Amino acid sequence: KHLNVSKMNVDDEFKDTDGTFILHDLQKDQTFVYNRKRANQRQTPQSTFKVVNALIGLQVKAVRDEYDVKRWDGVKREFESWNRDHTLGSAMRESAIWYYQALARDIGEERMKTWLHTLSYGNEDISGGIDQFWLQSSLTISPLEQETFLEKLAKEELPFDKPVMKIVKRMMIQEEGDHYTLYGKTGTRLTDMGLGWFVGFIKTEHGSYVFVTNVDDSGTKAKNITVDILKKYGLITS
Predict the structure, then answer these.
(1) How many domains are there within the chain?
(2) With contact defined as beta carbons under 8 Å apart, do 230 and 236 qualify?
(3) Is 185 annotated as a binding residue?
(4) Which domain holds residue 179?
């Protein structure tokens, strides 16, 4: 019934990819890591940082809720899903960077810095600029450090109001099946599609699990790898 993570193997998901995969069993307190070296290498978080931005932004009331609308400026950007008015939640779902750049500006350098130390978020380096630092810039975090943060979010053991964490979790929902809920956030270095993430957690009828996938490829690749693993190991069912 219950997936024992110490028994897994995911080699063939990465046979042609430089990557790492981490799976933490919340009920049993056990962590499986494929590619320990890469799991310990700090990398730029890309849009996985939206999770943190949303938590801080809601907590400090820079945004009201998942429906807080910011109007599009009419500039055609790389993805057509970005070229529309957005909310905190839709900008997470569609990875509309411009929305979260406006949010980061409202949070401000000093508040962001204090929060990143509270959250132990990687190298905590925001010198790349208040609306650039998480995008192939100064801030880096290892896949294992991402796991540590996301495990605290799953357990709701972070210094945010309970409704704030509930809202952010809801914004991360990717699939709601009959027997599981998949939560996650992609990230990609869009300059060259050369760095990819899919991070999150899955709730099943036999425990919840926290995952981090990171690859020298797109965030779509990271997500497809993660979904394949979660299906192979019986966590995504229906």
Answers:
(1) 1
(2) yes
(3) yes
(4) 5-232
The experimental method behind these coordinates is X-ray
204 forms beta bridges with 180, 207
Q: How far apart, in Å, do the first and last CA atoms of the chain sit?
A: 15
> Looking at 6, 47, 81, 127, which residue is catalytic?
47
Q: What is the CATH number of the domain that holds 155?
A: 3.40.710.10
Residue 237 lies in a domain: no
> Which of 155, 134, 162, 142 has its CA nearest to residue 51?
134
Question: Is 31 marked as a binding-site residue?
Answer: no
| 99/216 Cα distance (integer angstroms) | 26
Please indicate, yes or no, if residue 238 is contained in any of the structural domains.
no
Resolution, given in Å to one decimal, reads: 1.3
Is 47 catalytic? The answer is yes
Exposure b/e, 75-84, CB count within 10 A at least 16 = b: eeeeeeebbe
